[PDB]
From a paper:
The housekeeping enzyme glucose 6-phosphate dehydrogenase (G6PD) (EC 1.1.1.49) is the first and rate-limiting enzyme of the PPP. It catalyzes the oxidation of glucose 6-phosphate (G6P) originating from glycolysis to 6-phospho-D-glucono-1,5-lactone (6PL), whereby the cofactor NADP+ is reduced to NADPH. The LdG6PD monomer contains three domains: an N-domain (Q5-K49), the NADP+ binding “Rossmann-like” domain (residues D50-I248), and a β + α domain (residues D249-K552).
Crystals containing only NADP(H) diffracted to a resolution up to 1.7 Å, and crystals containing G6P or G6P and NADP(H) to 3.3 Å and 2.5 Å, respectively. Without bound G6P, the H250 and K254 side chains face away from the binding pocket, making the usual interaction with G6P impossible. Moreover, Y251 points into the G6P binding pocket, which would lead to clashes with the phosphate moiety of G6P in LdG6PD and homologous structures. Interestingly, NADP(H) is always visible in both monomers of the dimer, while G6P is visible in monomer B only. Therefore, structures complexed only with NADP+, were always crystallized under catalysis.
Author numbering:
A (entry chain B): 5 to 50, 55 to 551
B (entry chain A): 9 to 49, 56 to 475, 480 to 552
Write the structure that this text describes.
Amino acid sequence: QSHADQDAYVADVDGILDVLRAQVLERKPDDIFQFISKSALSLQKDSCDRINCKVKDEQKSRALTIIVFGASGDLAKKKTFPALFDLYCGGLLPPEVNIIGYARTKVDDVEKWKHETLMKYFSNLSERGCHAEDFLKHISYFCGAYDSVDDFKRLDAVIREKENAFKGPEKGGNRLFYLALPPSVFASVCESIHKGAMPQEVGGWVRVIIEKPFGRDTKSSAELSQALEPFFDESQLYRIDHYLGKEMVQNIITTRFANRIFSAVWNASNIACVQITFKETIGTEGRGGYFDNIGIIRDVMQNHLTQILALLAMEKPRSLDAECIRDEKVSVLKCIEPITKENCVLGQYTASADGSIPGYLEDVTVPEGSTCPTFAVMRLNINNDRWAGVPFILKAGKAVEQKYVAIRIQFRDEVHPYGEATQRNELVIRAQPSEAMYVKITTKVPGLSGDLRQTHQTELDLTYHTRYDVRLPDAYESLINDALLGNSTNFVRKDELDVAWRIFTPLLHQIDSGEIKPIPYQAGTRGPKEADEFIANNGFKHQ
Amino acid sequence: DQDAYVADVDGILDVLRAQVLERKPDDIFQFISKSALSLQKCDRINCKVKDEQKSRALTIIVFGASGDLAKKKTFPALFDLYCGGLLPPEVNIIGYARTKVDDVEKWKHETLMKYFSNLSERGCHAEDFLKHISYFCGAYDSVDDFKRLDAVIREKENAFKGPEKGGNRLFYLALPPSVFASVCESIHKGAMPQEVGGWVRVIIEKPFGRDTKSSAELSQALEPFFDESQLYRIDHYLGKEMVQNIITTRFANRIFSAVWNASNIACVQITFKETIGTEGRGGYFDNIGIIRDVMQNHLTQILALLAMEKPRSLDAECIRDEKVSVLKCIEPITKENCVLGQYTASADGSIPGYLEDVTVPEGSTCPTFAVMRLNINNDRWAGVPFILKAGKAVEQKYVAIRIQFRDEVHPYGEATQRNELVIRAQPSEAMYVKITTKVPGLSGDLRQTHQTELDLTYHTRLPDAYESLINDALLGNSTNFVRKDELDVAWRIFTPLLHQIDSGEIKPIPYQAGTRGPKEADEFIANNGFKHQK
Ligand SMILES: NC(=O)C1=CN([C@@H]2O[C@H](COP(=O)(O)OP(=O)(O)OC[C@H]3O[C@@H](n4cnc5c(N)ncnc54)[C@H](OP(=O)(O)O)[C@@H]3O)[C@@H](O)[C@H]2O)C=CC1
Ligand SMILES: NC(=O)C1=CN([C@@H]2O[C@H](COP(=O)(O)OP(=O)(O)OC[C@H]3O[C@@H](n4cnc5c(N)ncnc54)[C@H](OP(=O)(O)O)[C@@H]3O)[C@@H](O)[C@H]2O)C=CC1
C-alpha cells in the first residue's frame, strides 16, 4: 500500500543522497553543487546487483559476530570497515552476519556515523552504493570501555540476543574480535573478552585479530605475548600483516612444493643468492615523528620481509594445514644467527634533487639530529643443510627510485659449456607494483644465422592466465577472509614472533646505541651507494 | 569482391580456430589477438654468407640427378638456399647420372623447375638459379669419367673471381646405397679437390645398411676414400631448431640442467606420427619397416642428444663424442619391449589398408607401427624408461619429445601431478613446460590448483630442416650427422630385435588407419612408466 511504497521511496532517496554525500566528502570538490549534479546524472545512467553468496555451508550454519574495537579510529574507518564492505559485496560474509563497532567515543547519532563517517571510505560507490545501504544494516555501535566488566556483560547480552535469533542449524555463535586499537590496550581488552564475552558454551569459536606493532624488541614482544596467553591460545590469536597477500604466498608455496622442477633446485646446490626487496617512492609524508621511533627495520623488515623469507626458505611442511606451515616457518627462522652491524647498511633520505620531496630531517616533527634509518640493506645467514652459505639479502627503503616489492632468486651459473653465452638463471616473484612471477633463462636464437653459441635471455612467465581478467582483491581483505575461514598460515605465531625478534633485536640495540649511523641519500635515488656495494659484495651479480 | 572478402575472413578464422584448438589456452582472447598479429606476417637476393664462405670456388655435384630425390627435394632445397642467399654467389651445380639427356636446357626447364617451390616470390629467381646448373652424363664406376668430370669442375673453379685458389667440392649421393662405394672410389681416383686448395665433403643418403653387419660393411667400403670429417650421413628430419632446443635449454641453464636425470625424471617419450600411409608405394617400404625407416636413425639421434652427458665444448665433434658415449650405455632392445602394428583400411574406407596395396607381397608382416622401450644403463638414466614410438596412418601428424618428471606426492597429493617438458617439431615447433600453479582469486585456497602450460616457444602450423642440414654441410658443421662409430653403436641397439622380427618372433597387430594404433601399444606405454595428464 501507500506505506510500503513511501518507505521504499524515502529509502531510495536517502540511499542516493548518502552516496552523493560520500562522493563529495571524498572527492573534496570546490563546487559542491556542480559535483552533485554530474554525479547524480551519471548514477542514473548506470542495475547494480552482484551479491552471489559464495561462503561454504560451514560458514552460514552458525551465527557470526564481528566486533571491531576502536571503531572510531583511523584504521577502522579507512581500512577495516571498507574491507568488510568488500567481503560483503564479494559474497564472502554470512547473510546473517552481525557487525558491532565498539569504542569509547560518544556517538549521539549512530546512523549518521554509519552513513557519513563509515560510508565515506567505501570504495566504488558509483556501482556499489546500492549494496552500501544493505551492508550498513549489519552494523551497530556500542559506546563502552575496554576495561569494564559490566560493559562486557552488556555487550555479551547484545551479542547473545542476535546469536539466539539466528535462523540456522547450530546454536551459539562464532565471534571475531578485531583490535583496531593501540597495542597498549590489547592486554586489558583481551582480559575483558575472556571474562565477559567468550562464545556461548553451546557452540562457536573465538578469534582475535591483533594489530602491529607486536612489541619493538624481544623483551617487549614477549611481555605482550605473555600478557595475552592467559586469555587466548594460538588457535585464537591472529597477528596480522596487512602486506602479505594470499597471491604472493601461494606463488611461494605452490610453485615450489607442488612441482618437481622447482622443488629440486630450491637449495644451496643450485641457488647463488636471494634478495627480498620492499621499495617505496613516498617518504614519511609529514608523519616523520611517528616513524622516528620505529625506523625502517621494525617498520617492514623484522615483520613483513622476515615472514616472506620464512615461507621462501622453509622445509616441506608435513601437510598443507596452516599450523604445519607455521611449524616450518618457525623451524627455518631458528636457523638464523642474529644480524650483526657489519651485515647492515643504513640510509636516511635527504631532499630529492628536484625539490619535490623534502628531506627526512626537514619534517618539523622529526627530532633534530635524528639518526633514524629510512633505508636498510642487510644479510641474513640460514645455517642448515638446504641454505648454508646462501646469502639472503633483505632490503627496504623509503623515498627511493621506484615502488617495487619482489623476491629475486639467482641460480648458480652454468659456466660450461656456454661460457659467456649464458648467465645466472633468475626467478622473480613480484607483488608491487603488480603481481608477476617468471624465470629468466638462456634460450637459442631462432634462425639459421644463429649457431649453437648464439643465445639470448628470455623471461618465462610462470603464472596461470585465466580467460577473463578478474578483480584483484587486496592483501588485507584476503587476510580478514582467512581469519573468518580459520586459516592462520599468513599470521605470525607466538613462537615464530619470538624467534624473529631474536634475529633483529641485537642490531636494533646497536642502532639505538649509536653504533651504526645512516648514510644520507637523496630522495628518488636507489639509496646509499654503499648499499649497492654491499649487495655486490654479498653474492649478487648484475645481468 | 564481397564473396572473396568473406572467403578471406572465413579462411583467417579457420586458421585461428585450428591454432587456438591445438594450443587450447585458457586465455582464448589474448591468444587469438597475438596469433592474428602473427598471421599478418618478389625481391632481390642479399647474400647472408660469411666472407670466408665466398672466399673460394664452390662446386656441388649431385649424383643420381635423374632421380626422385634429386628432382623433388635436393635441387629444390638448393633453390631455396639460393633464394635465401645462403649459397655463395658464384656456386656451380652439376648433376651427374647415367641417363642420357640429349638436351640439358630442357631437362632443367621441364623437369627440374617443375618441382621448385613457387612461393610466387621465389619464382622470379628460377631462371637465375638454373644458370648455375649443368649436367654430366657418366658412369658412377668409371675412373676415366671422373677424370673427365674433374676437368669440367676445374674449368668452373678457375672461372672464380676471388684470390683464393682451387675450390671446395660438395658431392651429393642421391643414389641407392648399393652405388655409394663405386662413386666414392671414383671420386678418390678421379675428382678430389685441386692440390692448391679446397675441401671435399660427401653427403650420404639413407639407408646406412640394414643391420650391424651390413652397415659396418658399407662404412668399411667408404673409409679408404673419405674420413669422418668428409662424410656427412644425412637425416632430413633432424632440424637445427629442435637440436638447439635440446642442447641449449638444458646445458645453458642451471634450472633444467639440475633436473635432467633419473632423480627427477619419471619417463621420456620420443614420438613420430604421420596420418599418411605408405601411399601406394608400400612395396619398397616392405623390406624396410618402420623401425629401420625412422626409429634406429632419426629417433635414436634425438635420444642421443637428449640423454648425452655435457660435452667438453659446443664443437661438433665434442657433441658427437657424447652421442657415442650415451648410445654405448643403451641395452639392446628386447622383443618383450616392443609392440608392432600394421595398418588396415580406415573405418570410412578413405585410406586403403597396407596390404590392399598391390605392390605389397601378400601376407606381408612388415610393421608400419612400433612402440618400444629402451634402457639407458648409466648413472644419469638407470631405471628411466625411454619410449620410442613411430607410426604410419595413425590419428595425427605429430613429432615431439615428452619428458615427465617424478610427481611430488607431498604435500599436494591429488592437487598436483607430474611436471612435463615437451619439445615439439611437428606439426609446428613448440617447447613448453607443464607445472602446477595456484589459481588466482580468493575462491582458491592452497589446494585449488591448475595444470598450467608455460610456452618457451610456440609457432603456428624459413629454411626447413633439410635445407638447414645442407647448409650445415657447406659450413662444415657435422653435429646433426651420424658419425661412423655412432652409427655402429646404434645398429647394435636395434639389430637383435630386427633379426627377431625377420624370423617372425613378434608379429604386427592390425590397427585401422586413422586410429592411434594397436590398443596393446597404449597398454605397453602405460605399463612402462607413462602417466596420463589429468
Ligand atoms: N593505517 C593505519 O592506521 C594502521 C594502524 N595499525 C595499527 O592498528 C591499530 C589501530 O590504528 P589507528 O586507528 O591508526 O590508531 P588510533 O590512534 O586512531 O586509535 C584507534 C582507536 O583506538 C582508541 N584509542 C586511542 N588511544 C587509546 C587509548 N590510550 N586507550 C584506549 N583507546 C584508545 C581510540 O578510540 P576511542 O577513543 O573511541 O575508544 C582510537 O580512535 C594500531 O595498533 C596501529 O598501530 C597498523 C596497520 C595500519
Ligand atoms: N624422397 C626420396 O626419394 C627419399 C630417398 N632417400 C634415399 O635417397 C637416395 C636417392 O633416392 P631416390 O631418388 O628415390 O632413388 P632412385 O632409385 O630413384 O635413384 C636415383 C637415381 O639413381 C640412379 N639409379 C637407380 N638405381 C641405380 C643403380 N642400381 N645403379 C646406378 N644408378 C641407379 C638412377 O639414375 P641414372 O639411371 O640416371 O644413373 C636414378 O634415377 C636413396 O639412397 C634413397 O634411399 C632418402 C630420403 C628421401
